[PDB]
UniProtKB/Swiss-Prot annotation:
Gene: Rngtt
Subunit structure: Interacts with SUPT5H and RNMT. Interacts with POLR2A (via C-terminus); this enhances guanylyltransferase activity. Binds (via GTase domain) to the elongating phosphorylated form of RNA polymerase II; can form direct interactions with the phosphorylated POLR2A C-terminal domain and indirect interactions via bound RNA.
Location of the protein in the cell: Nucleus
Annotated phenotype, changing H121A: Decrease of 55-60% of TPase activity
GO BP field: 7-methylguanosine mRNA capping
Domain of life: Eukaryota
Effect of D62A: Decrease of >90% of TPase activity
Organism: Mus musculus (Mouse)
Name by which UniProt lists this protein: mRNA-capping enzyme
Source lineage: Eukaryota, Metazoa, Chordata, Craniata, Vertebrata
GO MF term set: ATP binding; GTP binding; inorganic triphosphate phosphatase activity; mRNA 5'-triphosphate monophosphatase activity; mRNA guanylyltransferase activity; phosphoprotein phosphatase activity; polynucleotide 5'-phosphatase activity
Amino acid sequence: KIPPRWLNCPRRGQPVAGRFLPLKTMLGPRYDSQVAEENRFHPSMLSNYLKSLKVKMSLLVDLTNTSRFYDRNDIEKEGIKYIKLQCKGHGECPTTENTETFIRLCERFNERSPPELIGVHCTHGFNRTGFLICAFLVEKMDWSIEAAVATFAQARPPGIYKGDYLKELFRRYGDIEEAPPPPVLPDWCF
Ligand SMILES: [Mg+2]
C-alpha cells in the first residue's frame, strides 16, 4: 500500500546550502493503480526535471530502509549514484554512526565542478532527511545548528517536526535547553 500522508506531501523542498535537495520517496509505476496521474512521482519525473534545468544530481541517498517503493536502476541508469543508507529504526533519530556514514559518503561528492546536487529522501522527506542534512551542515560546512534547522524549516516546510529530533540535534551541536519545540503542522498533514 502507498505510504500514509504521502499524496499531499510536496515532492521536493528547495535546495539547502546550495547542495542538498530534500525529497519525499519516489513511487514507481508499480503504484500507478493507487496514485492518480496528478500525484505521481516516478523516478523519471525527478530526472526529467533536473534535465530541464541543466542540473545534475551526483548522488541520491535513500534513507527508507526498504526497496519496495521504486527501482534503484531508474536512478542509476541516469548516471546518478544511488545509496541505501540504513538508519536506526523504532522511530529513534539517526545514531552518531549513521551521521558519520552520511557525512563520509556526502563529502566524496559535495565538491564537484560543475556543481551538482545530492538528493536525500526518507519516506516523507522531513525528519531523517532534515536531521542528516543539518548534521552535515554543522559538522562539515561550519554552520550553526540554529541556522541549519531554520534553513531546513524554510526550504522544506515545516522542517523537522519530531521534537526528539530537534532536541538531539541541539544536544549534539548546541545547547539542548535552547532546542525549539516542534512546529505546529499545516492542515494537509492529516
Ligand atoms: Mg520502469
